[PDB]
Each structure stands twice: as structure tokens, then as C-alpha cells.
């Protein structure tokens, strides 16, 4: 569910796994960079969708008045 995916933004199990592995001495910054992109994408993509929501709501409100 999307509620789950939004919660994957901050401190996922993948996040908790990747951090302790970096402390051991092997460079996981390549992998760590990838999770950053996706997690930011979740945030950003969800920000845009809600922005569209408001604007379609607005468009539908103007249409309602002219037709009803």
C-alpha cells in the first residue's frame, strides 16, 4: 500500500541494513546513493500528485459552476 511506501522514506529496513554495513569498512555509498534517489522520488512524486489533486479539484469546481 502507498501508506507503506511513504513510510519507507525515513529509516527503512533497507536503510538500517545499509548503514551498519558501511561502518564495517566496505563502501556502500553507491548503493546508499540509489536509495536516496528512490526515497526522494517517493517524496517528490507524492508532492506533485497532491499538487495536481488541488488543481484538478480547482478545475472541476470552475466546471461545476458553469454547468450547474
Amino acid at each position: 500500500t502507498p501508506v507503506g511506501v511513504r513510510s519507507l522514506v525515513e529509516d527503512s529496513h533497507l536503510m538500517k541494513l545499509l548503514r551498519e554495513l558501511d561502518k564495517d569498512g566496505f563502501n556502500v555509498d553507491g548503493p546508499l546513493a540509489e536509495l536516496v534517489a528512490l526515497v526522494n522520488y517517493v517524496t517528490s512524486s507524492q508532492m506533485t500528485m497532491q499538487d495536481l489533486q488541488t488543481h484538478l479539484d480547482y478545475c472541476a469546481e470552475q466546471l461545476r459552476k458553469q454547468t450547474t
Binding site: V9, E10, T43, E61
Partner: protein, 102 residues
């Protein structure tokens, strides 16, 4: 803190002129201007005005604050230049955004 964290959300007049001119990147006198950017002095409204035109802007723009109420944060120069019909789109949208709460 690398990721966005956006979903989880979360003063004097001379300090604003410091920020808003720093935000604005004859030209009368250089040292006069070199002081203003770090505050340290209070400028006159007549000198405030002629300085503003240098960028294409007006006087009040540089000393206008942005607290919670007046933080509708936009370029006034750009807005003033808009045609009326299109200014109507902005105020119609804003006033709709209000109604979506209560």
C-alpha cells in the same frame, strides 16, 4: 539527514534590506552600498528608492518582511507586469486554496 523529509513537514528592517538586496542578484556610491549588505546602518527611503530601480524593482520590496502572514513569497516586479485577466487566475486560485480548509 540526506532524504527530503518533506512529508513530515516542519528581526529588524536593516536585516531585511540585507537579505532582499542579497536576494536581488548608479548605483550611486559604492561604500554606501557595501555597508548595506551586512546591515550596520539605516538607509533613507529616498536612497532606498533610486537603489531599487537598478534591478527593475521598487522601494517597499526590499523592506517588506516575510512573516507567516506576509510570506506570500513572490517577485512583485513580475506580478505588476501581468495582464489583469491573468492576475485573476492567481487570486482565484489562492481564494480557492483557502476554501479547501474551512
Amino acid at each position: 539527514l540526506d532524504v527530503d523529509h518533506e512529508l513530515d513537514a516542519v528581526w529588524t528592517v536593516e536585516k531585511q534590506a540585507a537579505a532582499t538586496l542579497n536576494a536581488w542578484m548608479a548605483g550611486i556610491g559604492p561604500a554606501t552600498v557595501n555597508r548595506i549588505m551586512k546591515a550596520e546602518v539605516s538607509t533613507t527611503i529616498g536612497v532606498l528608492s533610486s537603489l531599487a530601480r537598478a534591478f527593475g524593482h521598487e522601494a517597499y520590496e526590499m523592506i517588506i518582511p516575510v512573516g507567516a502572514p506576509g510570506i506570500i513569497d513572490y517577485d512583485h516586479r513580475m506580478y505588476a507586469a501581468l495582464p489583469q485577466e491573468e492576475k485573476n487566475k492567481i487570486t482565484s486560485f489562492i481564494n480557492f486554496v483557502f476554501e479547501q480548509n474551512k
